[PDB]
Amino acid sequence: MKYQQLENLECGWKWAYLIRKHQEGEPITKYIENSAAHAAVDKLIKLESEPVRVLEWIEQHMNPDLFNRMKQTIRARRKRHFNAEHQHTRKKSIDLDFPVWHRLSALSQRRGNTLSETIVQLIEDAERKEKYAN
Amino acid sequence: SHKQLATEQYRHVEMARELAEQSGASSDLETDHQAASDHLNLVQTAMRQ
Amino acid sequence: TIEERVKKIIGEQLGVKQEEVTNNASFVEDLGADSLDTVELVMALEEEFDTEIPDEEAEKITTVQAAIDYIN
Amino acid sequence: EMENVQKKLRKLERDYYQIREQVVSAKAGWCAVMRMVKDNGVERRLHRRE
Amino acid sequence: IQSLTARAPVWLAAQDTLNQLCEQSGETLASSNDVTEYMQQLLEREREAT
DNA sequence: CCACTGTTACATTGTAACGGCA
DNA sequence: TGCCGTTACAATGTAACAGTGG
Ligand SMILES: *P(=O)(O)OCC(C)(C)[C@@H](O)C(=O)NCCC(=O)NCCS
Numbered sequence A: 001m002k003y004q005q006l007e008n009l010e011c012g013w014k015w016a017y018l019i020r021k022h023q024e025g026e027p028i029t030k031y032i033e034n035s036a037a038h039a040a041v042d043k044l045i046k047l048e049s050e051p052v053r054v055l056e057w058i059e060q061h062m063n064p065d066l067f068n069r070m071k072q073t074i075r076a077r078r079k080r081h082f083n084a085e086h087q088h089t090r091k092k093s094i095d096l097d098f099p100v101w102h103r104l105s106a107l108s109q110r111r112g113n114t115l116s117e118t119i120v121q122l123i124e125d126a127e128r129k130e131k132y133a134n
Numbered sequence B: 001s002h003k004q005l006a007t008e009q010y011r012h013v014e015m016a017r018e019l020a021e022q023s024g025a026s027s028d029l030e031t032d033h034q035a036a037s038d039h040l041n042l043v044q045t046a047m048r049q
Numbered sequence C: 001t002i003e004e005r006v007k008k009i010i011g012e013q014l015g016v017k018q019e020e021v022t023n024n025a026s027f028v029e030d031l032g033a034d035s036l037d038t039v040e041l042v043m044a045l046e047e048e049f050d051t052e053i054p055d056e057e058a059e060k061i062t063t064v065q066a067a068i069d070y071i072n
Numbered sequence D: 001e002m003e004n005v006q007k008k009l010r011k012l013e014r015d016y017y018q019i020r021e022q023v024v025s026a027k028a029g030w031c032a033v034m035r036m037v038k039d040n041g042v043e044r045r046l047h048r049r050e
Numbered sequence E: 001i002q003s004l005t006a007r008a009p010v011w012l013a014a015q016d017t018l019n020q021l022c023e024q025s026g027e028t029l030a031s032s033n034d035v036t037e038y039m040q041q042l043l044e045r046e047r048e049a050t
Numbered sequence F: 001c002c003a004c005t006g007t008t009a010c011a012t013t014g015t016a017a018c019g020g021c022a
Numbered sequence G: 001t002g003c004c005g006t007t008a009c010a011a012t013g014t015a016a017c018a019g020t021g022g
Helices: A007-023 A032-045 A051-061 A064-083 A098-111 A115-133 B001-047 C002-016 C035-048 D002-037 D041-046 E002-024 E032-049
Strands: none
Touching: A007 A032, A007 A051, A007 A064, A032 A051, A098 A115, B001 D002, C002 C035, C002 D002, C035 D002, D002 D041, D041 E002
């Protein structure tokens, strides 16, 4: 356990995630009958502003197959939330053209390094070449 | 620690310089002693003749 | 010019605008930057120019002009 | 022997460098919040020095 | 320093509570005896108002 | 000149797959 | 195992720049 988990925050995250999924059409509940699903979803909608009861709602009406996705989404949300405080822990997202990405990834799998590690090593070698010449 | 290391480097530089000086002195002495040995041999030959 | 660095960073570190700082004034009392703030200001100046400033030299920057005097 | 300590100094220097950027960015962020909060919020309400 | 630090938070919370309490009043208190008298004036005002 | 288009460099959120660890 | 961090993505949205043609 590296990041401490906060209930009033992670529970709001879960409520928002489930509401978003429902708005997207995902079946939040395990009830095939539309009436029970609608009733549970309405309970959830009016359940806003409640961690201790949204958790129970999840335990009682949650679709079995979304548990893992919700869990990993919350893991990622927690990690990003804790890492976004400091610059050095933040992450910068970029888009790479397919050939360039293919070659860079080829190098990374070949060397067993990650994209960050592979690029760091390559830049370090470029710098070293500069110093050799200079 | 940085200043400590820099000062140790400076001491090291000084002592290396002076030992280079003693190395030069040793070389000069070596030349002198080669000449001395040559003289010794010459004197020996003169004795025998 | 290059002083635009200093006269920018100072403000960003003290909440004042670019023209608010006067060369005659002093950071410690005439800018409102306290003990912690002056350490932070000098360390940000150190960071900006990718250089180093020992404690002794750093303590002689209480006035606005000194911030450029050691730089240029 | 001393060169190893020099390399350790380099490691320490890079760590210092990182910390320095952290601190300067933190002060940059703080600046504006001080400016706004000086509207009596910081006076005694927010600054619960306890 | 460590002893003072351990003492610190209690003292600071006490100071803040006292500051709030006195500021709530028009008077600023400076002594336990001063507080005792203020209490007496409070009782007098109470028994008058009642 | 001016408008509209193409492009890059991010952000933002979600997900699957590894791998560590009790 | 079951959780938890971690990576490498995917999809979409935006700001900013560079082009293009009238
Ligand atoms: P001032 O009341 O803001 O307090 C400043 C401080 C003691 C917190 C600190 O930032 C500071 O100014 N220290 C002076 C420099 C110093 O102590 N350097 C030590 C280097 S190892």
